[PDB]
Amino acid sequence: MRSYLILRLAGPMQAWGQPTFEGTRPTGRFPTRSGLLGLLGACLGIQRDDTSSLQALSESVQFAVRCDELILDDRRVSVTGLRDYHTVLGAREDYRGLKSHETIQTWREYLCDASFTVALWLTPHATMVISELEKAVLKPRYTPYLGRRSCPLTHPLFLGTCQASDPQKALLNYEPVGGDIYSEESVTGHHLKFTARDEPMITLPRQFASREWYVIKGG
RNA sequence: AUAAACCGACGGUAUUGUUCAGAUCCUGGCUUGCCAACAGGAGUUCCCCGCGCCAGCGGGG
């Protein structure tokens, strides 16, 4: 049995990116690999130019994300999408200089009434220990948020720690149970995969490599 | 420090003018509130005081 660090990602608004080079900023259904690394990298004091420990975090940690349905008054509330018409005045026209446009337009998608429970474990050749990752989520250095800085948390990042055989068995200890799980480690009775391009290329800033979740449906 | 960061969707604007709800219409007939009754019992009133026969009588609060 390995040690797991259990996290809770809850808030009225979330955003988990999909590939884009456009003014449209799309969200997926559950947290990304890159987004979870960034969240951890925020709790730790990692700066954007520190590629060394940026790569040390990525090589040390793997995730498992469970989608949690909001239950209210014994009624189920579904996750909905939200489109924000987001404008910027005096936005940069070039990457150097002070010339700017009057108005630019962007379109940003959010999730509403979404909540997630994240299982976290160490790779066989990890650098850090779950003990110091626990410290980081309890006392973050940079401000933690759900995808975008405008999206605060309504529940503490830290949920618990535990020991278990597989990520599914670990997430079982924490209500609410029943949601679909996406894991970096495969579990025995499941064979479905979820393709994604959310593996941050750390040697190539703001670029992403293809990878795959192992899909584990809830009962 | 997360397709992240930095980041307004903005600015102007009467809903206006006209218009009876109106005519007709008993709530109405019947019906004891009635039988019994001393307002008498019971001297606690806590003081100061003055004069006694010691029983009890007075003036001040």
Short mmCIF file of C-alpha atoms in Angstrom, two decimals, chain A residues 51-127:
data_model
loop_
_atom_site.label_atom_id
_atom_site.label_comp_id
_atom_site.label_asym_id
_atom_site.label_seq_id
_atom_site.Cartn_x
_atom_site.Cartn_y
_atom_site.Cartn_z
CA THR A 51 12.01 24.98 -14.65
CA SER A 52 14.13 22.85 -12.34
CA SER A 53 11.62 22.30 -9.54
CA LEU A 54 8.85 22.69 -12.10
CA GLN A 55 10.13 19.45 -13.59
CA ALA A 56 10.78 17.94 -10.17
CA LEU A 57 7.11 18.34 -9.27
CA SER A 58 5.90 16.83 -12.53
CA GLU A 59 8.15 13.77 -12.32
CA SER A 60 7.31 13.11 -8.68
CA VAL A 61 3.52 13.27 -8.62
CA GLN A 62 0.58 11.57 -10.33
CA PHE A 63 -3.13 12.29 -9.91
CA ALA A 64 -6.62 10.80 -9.83
CA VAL A 65 -9.68 13.02 -10.19
CA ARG A 66 -13.22 12.19 -9.12
CA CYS A 67 -16.21 14.22 -10.27
CA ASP A 68 -18.53 14.98 -7.36
CA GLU A 69 -22.20 15.78 -7.89
CA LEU A 70 -23.67 18.59 -5.83
CA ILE A 71 -26.56 17.33 -3.73
CA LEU A 72 -28.89 19.95 -2.36
CA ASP A 73 -31.82 19.20 -0.11
CA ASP A 74 -31.50 15.65 -1.22
CA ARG A 75 -31.75 16.83 -4.84
CA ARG A 76 -29.04 16.42 -7.46
CA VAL A 77 -27.65 19.57 -9.03
CA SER A 78 -25.83 19.08 -12.32
CA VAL A 79 -22.71 20.86 -13.52
CA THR A 80 -23.50 23.60 -16.05
CA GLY A 81 -21.35 25.60 -18.44
CA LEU A 82 -21.02 29.37 -18.35
CA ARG A 83 -19.87 31.73 -21.09
CA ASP A 84 -18.22 34.96 -20.01
CA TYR A 85 -17.96 37.79 -22.51
CA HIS A 86 -14.69 39.21 -21.20
CA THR A 87 -13.29 42.42 -22.68
CA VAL A 88 -9.98 44.18 -22.16
CA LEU A 89 -9.34 47.88 -22.62
CA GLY A 90 -5.89 49.08 -23.65
CA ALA A 91 -4.58 45.57 -24.26
CA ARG A 92 -1.07 45.15 -25.68
CA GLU A 93 -0.80 45.30 -29.45
CA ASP A 94 2.71 43.90 -29.55
CA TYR A 95 5.02 42.08 -27.15
CA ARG A 96 7.26 45.11 -26.74
CA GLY A 97 6.41 48.80 -26.63
CA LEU A 98 3.38 50.55 -25.22
CA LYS A 99 1.09 50.55 -28.25
CA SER A 100 -2.33 49.09 -27.54
CA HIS A 101 -5.81 48.42 -28.89
CA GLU A 102 -8.87 50.30 -27.73
CA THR A 103 -10.84 47.13 -26.99
CA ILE A 104 -10.25 43.42 -27.44
CA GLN A 105 -12.69 40.55 -26.97
CA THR A 106 -12.33 37.20 -25.23
CA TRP A 107 -14.73 34.38 -24.42
CA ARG A 108 -14.10 32.35 -21.29
CA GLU A 109 -15.94 29.20 -20.27
CA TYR A 110 -16.53 28.16 -16.68
CA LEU A 111 -18.06 25.22 -14.85
CA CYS A 112 -20.82 25.94 -12.34
CA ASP A 113 -21.81 23.85 -9.33
CA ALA A 114 -18.77 21.65 -9.88
CA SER A 115 -16.73 19.93 -7.18
CA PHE A 116 -13.84 17.48 -7.33
CA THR A 117 -11.89 15.15 -5.07
CA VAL A 118 -8.28 14.53 -6.04
CA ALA A 119 -6.09 11.60 -5.03
CA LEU A 120 -2.36 12.19 -5.09
CA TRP A 121 0.59 9.79 -4.87
CA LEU A 122 4.35 9.66 -5.49
CA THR A 123 6.10 8.13 -8.48
CA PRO A 124 8.62 5.33 -7.75
CA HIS A 125 11.50 7.78 -8.24
CA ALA A 126 9.94 10.90 -6.74
CA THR A 127 11.98 13.75 -5.29
#
